Amino acid sequence: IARTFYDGPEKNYEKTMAILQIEAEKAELRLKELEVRRLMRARGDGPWYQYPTIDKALIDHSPKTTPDN
Amino acid sequence: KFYIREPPHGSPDWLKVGLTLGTSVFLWIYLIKQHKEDVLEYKRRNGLE
Amino acid sequence: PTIRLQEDPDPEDENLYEKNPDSHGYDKDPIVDLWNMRVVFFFGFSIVLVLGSTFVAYLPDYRMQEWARREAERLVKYREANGLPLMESNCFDPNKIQLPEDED
Amino acid sequence: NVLQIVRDHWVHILVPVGFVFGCYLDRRSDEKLTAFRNKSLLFKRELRPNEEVTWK
Amino acid sequence: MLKIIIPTTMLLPMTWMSKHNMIWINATVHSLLISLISLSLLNQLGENSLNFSLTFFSDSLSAPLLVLTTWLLPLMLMASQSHLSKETTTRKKLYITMLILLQLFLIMTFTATELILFYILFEATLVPTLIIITRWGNQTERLNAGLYFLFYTLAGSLPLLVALVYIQNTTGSLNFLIIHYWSHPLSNSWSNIFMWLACIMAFMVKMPLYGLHLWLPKAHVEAPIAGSMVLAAVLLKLGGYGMMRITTILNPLTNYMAYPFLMLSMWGMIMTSSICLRQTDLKSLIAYSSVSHMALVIVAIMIQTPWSFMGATALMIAHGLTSSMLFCLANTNYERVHSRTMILARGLQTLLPLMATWWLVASLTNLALPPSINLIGELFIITASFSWSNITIILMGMNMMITALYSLYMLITTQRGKYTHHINNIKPSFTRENALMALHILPLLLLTLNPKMILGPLY
Amino acid sequence: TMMSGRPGRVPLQFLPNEARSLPPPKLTDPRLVYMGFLGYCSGLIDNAIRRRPVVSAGLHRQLLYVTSFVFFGYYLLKRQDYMYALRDHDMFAYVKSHPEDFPEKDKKTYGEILEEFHPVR
Amino acid sequence: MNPIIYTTLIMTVMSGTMLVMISSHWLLIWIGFEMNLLAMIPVLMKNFNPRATEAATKYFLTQATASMMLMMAIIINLLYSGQWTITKMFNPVAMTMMTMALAMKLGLSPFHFWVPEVTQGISLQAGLLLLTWQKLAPLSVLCQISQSINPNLMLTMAMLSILIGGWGGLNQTQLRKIMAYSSIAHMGWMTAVLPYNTTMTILNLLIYITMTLAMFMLLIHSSATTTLSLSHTWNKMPVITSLMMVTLLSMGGLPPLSGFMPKWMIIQEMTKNESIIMPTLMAMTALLNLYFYMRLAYSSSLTMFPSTNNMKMKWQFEHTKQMKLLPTMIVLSTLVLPMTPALSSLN
Amino acid sequence: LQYGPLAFVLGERTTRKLTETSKVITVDGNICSGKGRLAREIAEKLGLRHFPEAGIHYADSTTGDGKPLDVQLSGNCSLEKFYDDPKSNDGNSYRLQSWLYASRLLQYADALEHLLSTGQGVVLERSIYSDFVFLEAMYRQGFIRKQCVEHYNEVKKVTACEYLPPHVVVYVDVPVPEIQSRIQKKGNPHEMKITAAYLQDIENAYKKTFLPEMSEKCEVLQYSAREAEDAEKVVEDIEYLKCDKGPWPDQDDRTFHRLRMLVQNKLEVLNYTTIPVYLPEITIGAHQSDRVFQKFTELPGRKYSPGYNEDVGDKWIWLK
Amino acid sequence: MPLVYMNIIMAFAIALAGLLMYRSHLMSSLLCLEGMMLSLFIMSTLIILNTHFTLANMMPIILLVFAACEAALGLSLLVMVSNTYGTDYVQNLNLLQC
């Protein structure tokens, strides 16, 4: 029965270690992502949460019929 | 039997069948070519093959 | 009409034993009935029940309980041959444990 | 005789084929978790001079 | 373990493509084959689980439940094909589809490896059951029964979803292995108290706890026979499985929290066992029996000792089998006389002898006769409770006396005395009914032959 | 909100040029197979609603349903993978550029940490 | 109405919505709203009767008042900062005015009163348009300015909408009023997560639109506007009623259906914040919507109501014009939960 | 291209196929009048299409094969049983009346569709506009109740308002003794049981209400028994009418487009016939409904759409 | 902020309240709507005139155009309501109560 239908304990043991490593990495990544999101939303120095500002290419830098602009 | 002969023909509407099968075949061929091009482009960028 | 609906009357129960005095209570068609009985009996009592119980009774000891008995025998033999307490109240060696230096 | 009985009882192969496909899919799934094959502190073993993997 | 999941999804189109007079045969045969396949999960290890893939796993607590589900489907198929004889082929295939979907959701539920997937399947099980009850029931109360069944569950289970997402946001994962290895104690806080309540109350409602147990008599009495079988055998054990899984995170908060639930469980044990003494309806009597047994399981899970968990697993399996058999036995008489009143058909031992001995063996296993697995589980829980407190024996003792009382009362009322004179349409028992009874009862004895298979991971 | 404004982003591209440096989803991807299953279900529901033999009425239109769903699903999966890759890239870069907010703490062993014990009795 | 004129009016409605979506100028967004309303009024009145006139008048008055408030908010924002660009909304009084204007355009409580009356008074096609397409522009504008949005006001209106939709739906026998109240509750669910994540808002919007399109198309296929007229459908179109029952279950939010996914994501996003109490109340209140969906399912699919004799003549005739995408909308409205992670293509 | 908005935006208008000889004509007379033969003669002289009077199985003739179905699957009422027992407590009288009204509504829709699609005129042997005379005859004789009359009035109010009245209303006036004599000379045993009061009520209703009401919007040409045989006179009398009073001269292309969209889609035509008003005479329980409907789909060519029934000879199904 | 700005904003608020409160005739509500347009036009013009923004001088024109569009829409609806009931009373618009 063991030979025909099942495997040794090494296979399940090492598959369990692989699965545990994957899940632990995913957990630490989720916590890190939450912290990074909080920091970027608080500061705004990150790529994320960049709200638009007015493009300076719209400004007209020409004499304005009055020297004091 | 039918009193009137059911405008959807008793034979297949060969025009609709034709362009339906044609667009299915075209979509499949385009998807295969897109997949091959994506695989080659990805291998080219990442220095694999 | 003194009624509320054009509703069918409630039909009476159809006794399966009437048209088939040996009816097995599976289907109205005797052939399908007999074969339903046969497949249920063969795949339930013959295949799953007996063969499955035999398979369960001869499952290999993956629970590792003869192994545990053998290990216990070896440790008891070794420990009693050397005048040892045969079991220690500390599951782990206290040397690899760093208790807080003070609780005062 | 074969044609009609096959067209009548072709449905009896769906569940056995499903079981075979499930076995194959289990094999494909567990061949993706080999990151620790023959690397455990408890089962790290020297490979025999003829094999290549401790378990498939 | 897709070797079990995919054959059920293949049961689906095989049923939908089978010819009109071969649906029951094909469904029964291939469901029996699937149960034979699933029987291979009982080869459990002794230290860790069977981690098949990243999403499915199995230990010795879920393997007996999976085997019970896969075995129960063919029994429900056999019991259903009598009252659906006049039904059109399409709606017969729809009924079989409902049963198959219920099995698939249950199979994935017992092996889902993280809490959110388990929750999704746990609540997905509600839709096929509701459709079955409210579409194929007989009386006008099936609608209200389905409403009670749905809303009692959802009211207790939505806070569980909120708590689960909160837990994952705080700890980072909900995979059971990571949750167990990285577990940390709960502080004695109001926030922690309410998170405990949110984690526990869904499974309390599902067990059900004595308080929130009202949906159960309505649902089990108004349901068709297969619906009653699946409700009593498997669907009540989802709460026990969920508690035995979720409790690891809850401790040490459980010690001062479990008091109201323990008190409710024990006193309601007594109360619901006393209710069965004055039940004029057979199905309601069996339903209240289920309530009392599951209260015992709640006590076992709450006190959290290894003997408690072993007894809870054994009792869950034993009750599933016994309650299924009792419901089928009651349904045979119901199909005979078209009424559920206990005192209508009396003295049935004279006219149906073999069915009478089926009744006797079902009643014997219900009142926990040794050395059945029913008594193994009950006695393990009783010993654990005696260790918890020596005063529990009084309550436990009272319950045993009332359980034997109503079990033998039901047997005597239905089977003994003199047959009612007016009823003359009691036909001899069919081979299908006797086979169904035998297929319920033989596994119980074969399991008491080898009892370690249903004693859980603490064994 | 969070990803709406990002530097160097083309408005309605749906698939930036930098997404081609990612491995394309396999054609036997289980999500693509599920999309094809959705197409098959749409075809069957189309047959049933119009009162036609559900399994066998229109094979060309069912094939068109399946291939349309697969075709849309492939690009949907590509964009999904690209956005998740962007999320991970940005998070890693932010962690690297702000060391003081993500400091590596001292490694302690379970022989040194004192966990309180709660007996079960 | 002439088909050419009807097509022109529908395209004008759609072009107003697109102008609202593609404009960076406040005046152009206001013009888009006004164009949308101007072309939308006749469509409600396509089939002329006193009820359609009433619905058109009430809708016009509500939307005109909302346009008043929106223009006033724009002008105040201009006064306190000479900016015409749709941005953070530098003034808080203008922000409150804008929030109430857009909420009253959407139908959020306490401004919810107009929606049940207008939906009941128009046909099923105009009701479909009103309850699906007319929500995009106000929600787009709300998404664009969600940074400056006040959490206390928006969350209050969202919770009020959920409660009122759930309660009002319980009392309804007509199908159009049921759909309107469900629309109000879904609007509340959409706007609750708006200050936290607009991607979740867009996801809930798409799922709700798919379910609503499926439900209106089913109600148009089986020409039913009341509970008892839909109770007859099983005797002519059993498949339609079964599909409708599954769609109703999906609308309720029970897993593993598509409807469950938007609430599941919104709850997760809110609990990423602290925000524990409010999602709990939202779920316990969505229970009411599930209840009256189940009442409809009991009346239409899970039981068989008495029929009439003249249905035998309907048994001999087919459905003449079949609406396209009905099959696709049903499938997307039920079997899409396993594709949940694909929401990352929305941000 | 099936007619719809697309066929209207480009090309197809219907005022360019109306050729002044369309003239929807309906012939009305008391039971056992020469109205049928007069209508046939009028149709074959004018070159119009003749519509034989709609009976119980009229809808059967336009669907599937023209052969009628069983009474249990269509109609669920018989005219013979109404003549035998007009006061039976099973509700046969009003059930027959309502089924006949629905059949007449369907036939009017078909006639209007033919008129608006080909321009050719039609001749009808009765209409929904004159079916109420039998309703009033049954009510006055105690055959039906007042609730049945109210239900009929609601259905007629919500249904008949959407169509155009006929151009010409032809009435064949035959007095009650003469129609009784003709019935006696007929040979049918069942009819011979018609009391004279029933025919008098039908005649009273026709003269008092149908003709006065149709006078404000139609051309009414009364005749007598002896004037009907010479149909040439009737045809040349129709040729010299002035169709100026009805709503037909006020119809544009948009009104015709709406009406043409309505006359097809027979489900939309019959929509309001099955309103959820629970009269015991016409309401059918769930069990009987399910049984009869299941029996209906078991018919040879009725399970699927009119092009996908394999068991009536439809081939190439998998490619449609 | 000047005091003329207070007066214009108070005019807008008064017109909004007048619209909100309904007496009998619909016509008066449309008058209040047109007054709200008038106040918005005046406020926009004053702000636009005060800070010399040259290109926004056209937006009051567009505001008046769309104000006229609203006025025409309301008048058409009032025509149809009066045709149905003979009076423009809002009390008659209560069919959608049930």
Ligand SMILES: CCCCCCCCCCCCCCCCCC(=O)OC[C@H](COP(=O)([O-])OCC(O)COP(=O)([O-])OC[C@@H](COC(=O)CCCCCCCCCCCCCCCCC)OC(=O)CCCCCCCCCCCCCCCCC)OC(=O)CCCCCCCCCCCCCCCCC
């Ligand atoms: C998770 C795992 C997978 C699960 C996924 C979900 C389920 C599967 C997908 C669902 C969608 C697919 C189909 C939908 C359209 C079908 C509609 C229908 O009516 O079908 C009729 C049709 C039979 O009709 P027919 O033959 O044309 O002639 C008879 C008349 O048509 C007879 O016509 P009629 O007019 O007499 O019918 C009347 C009847 C008709 O009413 C219905 O049939 C109900 C329609 C189903 C609703 C579907 C809505 C959308 C799907 C959502 C599913 C939810 C799942 C989540 C769990 C919650 C459950 C609700 O209505 C009633 O009698 C009232 C009963 C009220 C009961 C209320 C419960 C209904 C809802 C339950 C839905 C659950 C899923 C059912 C799936 C299959 C159902 C056919 O059924 C089929 O034949 C199709 C079955 C599937 C075909 C697959 C076969 C492919 C080849 C086989 C081999 C496989 C691979 C081979 C390779 C191997 C190598 C060798």
Ligand SMILES: CCCCCCCCCCCCCCCCC[C@@H](O)O[C@H](CO[C@H](O)CCCCCCCCCCCCCCC)COP(=O)(O)OCC[N+](C)(C)C
């Ligand atoms: C000497 C023997 C005396 C005693 C006999 C004892 C009787 C035992 C037989 C009963 C078997 C119980 C069923 C349990 C099957 C286990 C299924 C699964 O776990 O095994 C699969 C193994 O495949 C097996 O071949 C399964 C075949 C068993 C199929 C059972 C069908 C029996 C039904 C017969 C009904 C009669 C049909 C006639 C109809 C009228 C796994 O696939 P795979 O991942 O690769 O294997 C991994 C291990 N390896 C690599 C070492 C091989």
Ligand SMILES: CCCCCCCCCCCCCCCCC[C@@H](O)O[C@H](CO[C@H](O)CCCCCCCCCCCCCCC)COP(=O)(O)OCC[N+](C)(C)C
């Ligand atoms: C009608 C006539 C009645 C009277 C006549 C009766 C005829 C004679 C019967 C009397 C004989 C009594 C039996 C005596 C006991 C002998 C059997 C015993 O030896 O087997 C047991 C074994 O029992 C089996 O394990 C029973 C299997 C349990 C049943 C499997 C389940 C079947 C599937 C059905 C679905 C169930 C779903 C519920 C969840 C599981 C012992 O366990 P174990 O010592 O270790 O194994 C011994 C072999 N070893 C040493 C190599 C290990």
Ligand SMILES: CCCCCCCCCCCCCCCCC[C@@H](O)O[C@H](CO[C@H](O)CCCCCCCCCCCCCCC)COP(=O)(O)OCC[N+](C)(C)C
């Ligand atoms: C029908 C069946 C329904 C199911 C029944 C479920 C029962 C759930 C009850 C949960 C039990 C524990 C909840 C409260 C924990 C402590 C008990 C309470 O007495 O607190 C005391 C405090 O005194 C006061 O009682 C405080 C609570 C006052 C408010 C509670 C009154 C609620 C009335 C009961 C309503 C019935 C419940 C069902 C509602 C539908 C203890 O003093 P202290 O050691 O300092 O605080 C310990 C907790 N700390 C450490 C986190 C602070």
Ligand SMILES: CCCCCCCCCCCCCCCCC[C@@H](O)O[C@H](CO[C@H](O)CCCCCCCCCCCCCCC)COP(=O)(O)OCC[N+](C)(C)C
């Ligand atoms: C039940 C599911 C409902 C789905 C709704 C319909 C499904 C089909 C969608 C139609 C596909 C065509 C749409 C766009 C294709 C090309 C246009 C391209 O430019 O779009 C870009 C990107 O494409 C779209 O934005 C994403 C469309 C993807 C829709 C599918 C996601 C469904 C949600 C998850 C449910 C699972 C569904 C599985 C398939 C049925 C826009 O980028 P950007 O200008 O920057 O966005 C501005 C707005 N933002 C930033 C606030 C988002």
Ligand SMILES: CCCCCCCC/C=C\CCCCCCCC(=O)O[C@H](COC(=O)CCCCCCC/C=C/CCCCCCCC)COP(=O)(O)OCCN
């Ligand atoms: C069949 C009917 C059964 C119905 C039972 C349903 C109620 C279940 C018990 C309460 C469920 C709601 C719990 C909320 C979700 C838990 C999440 C959690 O615990 O996190 C807490 C949040 O805790 C809460 O906010 C709990 C608020 C509770 C509000 C909901 C009221 C529900 C009714 C309360 C009394 C009834 C509950 C018991 C009734 C039992 C059934 C009879 C910590 O969050 P922070 O805000 O960050 O605090 C620490 C950081 N400073």
Ligand SMILES: Nc1ncnc2c1ncn2[C@@H]1O[C@H](COP(=O)(O)OP(=O)(O)O)[C@@H](O)[C@H]1O
């Ligand atoms: N609305 C109705 N209600 C009851 N009976 C009707 C109705 N309409 C027609 N009939 C019956 O149909 C039969 C045929 O009508 P008729 O045209 O007068 O005979 P014929 O076709 O020989 O000219 C008559 O017996 C008449 O009573």
